[PDB]
Write a protein that holds these residues in place. Structure first.
Motif: not given
Lengths: 286, 150, 233, 52, 94, 152
Positions: D4-10, D17-24, F113-120
């Motif tokens: 899952f996409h998330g990071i711990l803050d000790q 918990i976050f959602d990421e588009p890591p690559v273009d 929901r999260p707002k992408d630049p494309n959405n904006l």
């Protein structure tokens, strides 16, 4: 309810011919006629038309005459020549809607219940399409109270078959400039769009000036629509909008830069090849 | 393809020439075989137009003003840019391969070398043109809208 | 310096002339206190020098670049120190960089005493003398690069300085000079490094890409104008 | 393991918990194209020796 | 009344204006949204309401003249940009 | 009751039980009750399910209106404890009925929901297109008014 009206170029040129001939006859300002066509499940198609005798008193908006007997006879002959076309509406070259138009439409509704009016400005002092499509509808108000028959706009566009397209392109040796590239994408839009927007805003300004001074009475519906427009006008100083704009611009410029680099490398390749060829030719000639 | 005709009697020359206007068409071989200048003669066709006809013909292809300022879905735009750049990558590989040739090629063999085989240089140029046009148009439209609409 | 300021170098000059001009301007700016501009210009000069030949010019520019980078407080790349051509020449500067990184006035003075004459011969002795006293700048740079918030006492301990007052003065000097993006706070007594801004959301990428786009378009235009079609001769 | 996409803050005992588009997928293609065109320019350098 | 650029009311302000305690502000705004008088959102954490659209109302001649002035500004901007584009790209479009 | 469940406004379980509590459960001689909410275990389960339905309706409405709410306020408006409201919202999110994100440290529930630049940018473009269409419609209305009031 009509979602779109497609007016073929032959209809427009026939309207122009009718206008020219009646004008040569003299003493007339607007021309009227029928629009034969066909239906394609809420996407109209106007393919042909024929002239119809019509006269009106320039003072009274209630003394007008349309020869429906001639309309029926010519429709019978046109049906005998091409069955697939049936009466769909009427057209008139008047620059803007007249007050007799609802009456004429009521007359034509006895031949086409869903009659569609098409106004073709044969002398367009503007920058836009020459066709405006209207459909008669009953309007129910809240304070205007009596329900009147008003004309409602319908999207109109110009399409063509293969033969019509070939003929128009052949005849278009008047001023031909395709330049589909950035040049046309800058003239057909950008400039044209801004000019048209300025024209529409100037029309709204003229109406508002007339209303404020007192030549015209107040129209609450128009004022409400103007309020909605001014509300829709966005705000471009928001930090989030600015950041998104910069991000997208950066992406687009990345792609543009890569394309320019490819172009430069190709140009260098061409230069090297040309120099090789010239040096070899000089050596051989020597 | 259109022509106008009239007949020749059983006689001499069918017509009199007082200018060069008649002899500017080079009658076609098919018409000559089927009887041109023997049983009938042609007449030049001219397409004189009036001002309103000219204006309507020019206005036929004019689009609505809003279409000009309308932008284009940014998701679709980015997807198209990505697709074309990915294609340009392979085209660049093939271009590198092709540049190494053109020295080990007969002067005649080069012409037939690009028969049935892709041309990376030509495709790269076309893709560059399309990308430049699309991106420049989109950026300029975005800025114009940014100012016009508040 | 006056001649450079008042004369505009021709843009349509050979790459060799550009390399010479860039080297000399970088030398002037380095002798004066313009280390950033000197490093930029001299990197450009070395980049524009001919690839294969010009070995001596490469050695000279490399030595000056090493010294100016050390003065600025960075660490020169080690790849250049093993190239066959520039190997033996740059050994004294290799030792100087070693001492600067593991800052030790004993080692620095030993290196200077040993290779004193060669620095004079090559024209960098004065700059090396400046480095010998601004060495600590590199240590402060490493501390800023590593730590997001450190106490002045800890900085003094790491930099082998006297009481934390000297460390505070050194850090303030560096911050004003722009070597480190940090702010001091004595009400608690620690130096806090500034945040990293999102460069992409800024307009800077647009400017960089516009510069490069214009350069590419100019290249294409000139490469098309360079074409000759000679048959009509 | 990227379950899952998330990071711990000790210290704070938190799990973000976050959602990421890591690559273009456009920048990567641009970089690969830049490398390929660098190879093309190298080949052009080789070919230009005939000019000399 | 609030200008379009701020249009971000606060719970205390609504309570003071409508003579109701801060707690009922949320229900009042939700009733407005449900009926369709206003469009927007409610941010309880920050105690604000972001109104994006209020129902059209009848305006007098002074307000009509104000709308006319705003249209004048808008048209001036449009004409300025049209002139800019035409002048800068005359070379490609003649 | 149908109008209550169709209207997009908050409803209270206590108010519902007070008003319709007896009519739908015990009934009256003029209008007899139904076995839907009888005194049997089936009826008890159905009553509990109706309460859950009320809670879900409240959550859906306060998600339609509300960008951010506090957990204390959501519990206070749902008439449940903080833990119970958290469990209900978590179950809804897991089942995918509604979208929500709980920031337990700050006690905030985010419904946007999260707002992408494309959405904006797409939203901005849609606003511009709507503006142009409205301008065209206003021009048509103005032309009609001028036609009606100008000849005389």
């Amino acid at each position: 309810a009509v979602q779109k009206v497609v007016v073929h170029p032959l209809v427009l040129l026939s309207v122009v011919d009718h206008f020219n001939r009646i004008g040569k006859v003299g003493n007339q300002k607007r021309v009227v006629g029928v629009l034969l066509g066909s239906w394609q499940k809420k996407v109209l198609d106007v393919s042909n038309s024929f002239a119809v005798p019509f006269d009106e008193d320039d003072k009274d908006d209630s003394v007008w005459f349309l020869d429906h007997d001639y309309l029926e006879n010519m429709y019978g002959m046109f049906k005998k020549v091409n069955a697939r076309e049936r009466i769909v509406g009427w057209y008139h070259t008047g620059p803007k809607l007249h007050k007799n138009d609802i009456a004429i439409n009521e007359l034509m509704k006895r031949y086409c219940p869903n009659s569609v009016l098409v106004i073709i400005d044969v002398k367009p002092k503007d920058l836009g399409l020459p066709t405006e499509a209207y459909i008669s509808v009953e309007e129910v108000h809240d304070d205007g109270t009596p329900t009147s028959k008003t004309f409602e706009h319908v999207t109109s566009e110009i399409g063509a078959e293969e033969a019509e397209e070939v003929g128009v392109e052949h005849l278009l040796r008047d001023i031909k400039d395709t330049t589909v590239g950035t040049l046309s994408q800058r003239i057909t839009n950008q400039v044209h769009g801004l000019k048209g927007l300025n024209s529409k805003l100037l029309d709204i300004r003229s109406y508002l000036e007339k209303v404020a001074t007192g030549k015209l009475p107040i129209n609450h519906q128009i004022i409400y629509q103007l309020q909605d427009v001014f509300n829709l006008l966005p705000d471009v100083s928001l930090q989030e909008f600015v950041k998104a704009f910069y991000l997208k611009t950066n992406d687009q410029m990345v792609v543009v830069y890569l394309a320019s680099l490819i172009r430069s490398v190709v140009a260098l390749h061409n230069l090297i090849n040309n120099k090789i060829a010239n040096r070899d030719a000089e050596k051989k000639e020597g | 393809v259109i022509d106008a005709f009239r007949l020749i009697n059983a006689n001499h020359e069918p017509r009199q020439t007082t200018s060069n206007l008649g002899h500017l068409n080079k009658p076609s071989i098919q018409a000559l075989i089927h009887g041109l200048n023997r049983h009938y003669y042609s007449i030049t066709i001219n397409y004189r137009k009036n001002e309103l006809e000219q204006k309507m013909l020019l206005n036929l292809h004019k689009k609505s003003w809003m279409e000009g300022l309308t932008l284009q879905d940014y998701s679709e735009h980015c997807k198209h840019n990505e697709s074309v750049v990915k294609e340009m990558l392979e085209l660049a590989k093939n271009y590198n391969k092709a540049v190494e040739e053109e020295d080990k090629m007969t002067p005649e063999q080069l012409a037939i070398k690009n028969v049935g085989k892709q041309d990376p240089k030509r495709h790269l140029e076309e893709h560059v043109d399309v990308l430049m046009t699309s991106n420049i148009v989109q950026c300029l439209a975005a800025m114009l809208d940014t100012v016009v609409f508040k | 310096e006056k001649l450079v300021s008042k004369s505009v170098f021709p843009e349509q000059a050979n790459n060799n002339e550009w390399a010479r001009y860039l080297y000399y301007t970088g030398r002037i700016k380095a002798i004066q206190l313009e280390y950033s501009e000197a490093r930029r210009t001299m990197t450009n000069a070395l980049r524009k020098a001919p690839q294969h030949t010009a070995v001596g010019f490469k050695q000279t520019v490399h030595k000056l670049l090493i010294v100016v980078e050390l003065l600025l407080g960075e660490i020169p790349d080690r790849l250049q120190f093993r190239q066959p051509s520039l190997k033996r020449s740059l050994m004294p500067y290799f030792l100087l960089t070693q001492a600067v990184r593991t800052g030790n006035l004993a080692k620095f003075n030993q290196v200077l005493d040993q290779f004193g004459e060669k620095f004079q011969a090559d024209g960098t002795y004065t700059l090396i003398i400046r480095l010998r006293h601004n060495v600590i700048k590199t240590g402060v740079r490493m501390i800023s690069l590593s730590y997001s918030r450190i106490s002045l006492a800890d900085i003094a301990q790491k930099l082998q300085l006297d009481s934390p007052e000297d460390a505070e003065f050194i850090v303030a000097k560096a911050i004003r000079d722009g070597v480190i993006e940090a702010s001091i706070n004595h009400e608690k007594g620690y130096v806090q490094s500034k945040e990293m801004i999102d460069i992409y959301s800024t307009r800077e990428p647009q400017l960089a890409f516009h510069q490069r786009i214009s350069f590419c378009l100019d290249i294409h235009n000139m490469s098309v104008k360079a074409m000759r079609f000679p048959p009509k001769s | 393991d990227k379950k899952f996409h998330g990071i711990l803050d000790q210290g704070e005992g938190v799990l973000i918990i976050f959602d990421e588009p890591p690559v273009d997928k456009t920048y990567e293609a641009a970089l690969e194209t830049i490398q390929n065109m660098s190879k093309v320019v190298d080949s052009l350098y080789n070919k230009a020796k005939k000019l000399t | 009344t609030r200008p379009a650029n701020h249009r971000q009311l606060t719970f205390e302000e609504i309570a003071k204006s409508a003579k109701i305690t801060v707690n009922e502000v949320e229900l009042l705004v939700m009733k407005a949204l449900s009926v369709g008088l206003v469009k927007g959102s409610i941010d309880e954490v920050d105690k604000r309401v972001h109104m994006t659209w209020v129902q059209p109302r009848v305006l007098d001649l002074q307000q009509i003249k104000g709308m006319k002035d705003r249209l004048e500004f808008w048209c001036t901007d449009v004409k300025s940009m049209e002139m800019l584009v035409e002048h800068q790209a005359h070379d490609i479009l003649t | 009751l149908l109008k209550l469940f169709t209207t997009m406004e908050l409803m209270r379980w206590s108010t519902l039980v007070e008003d319709y509590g007896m009519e739908l459960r015990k009934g009256s001689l003029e209008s007899p009750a139904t076995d839907v909410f009888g005194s049997t275990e089936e009826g008890e389960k159905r009553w509990k399910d109706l309460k859950n339905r009320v809670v879900e309706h409240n959550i859906r409405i306060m998600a339609k209106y509300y960008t951010r709410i506090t957990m204390k306020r959501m519990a206070q408006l749902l008439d449940l404890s903080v833990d119970e409201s958290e469990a209900f919202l978590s179950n809804l999110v897991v089942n995918k009925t509604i979208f929500a994100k709980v920031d337990r440290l700050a006690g905030i529930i985010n419904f946007q929901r999260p707002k992408d630049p494309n959405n904006l940018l797409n939203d901005w473009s849609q606003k511009l297109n709507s503006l142009m269409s409205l301008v065209n419609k206003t021009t048509h209305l103005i032309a009609k008014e001028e036609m009606i009031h100008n000849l005389q």
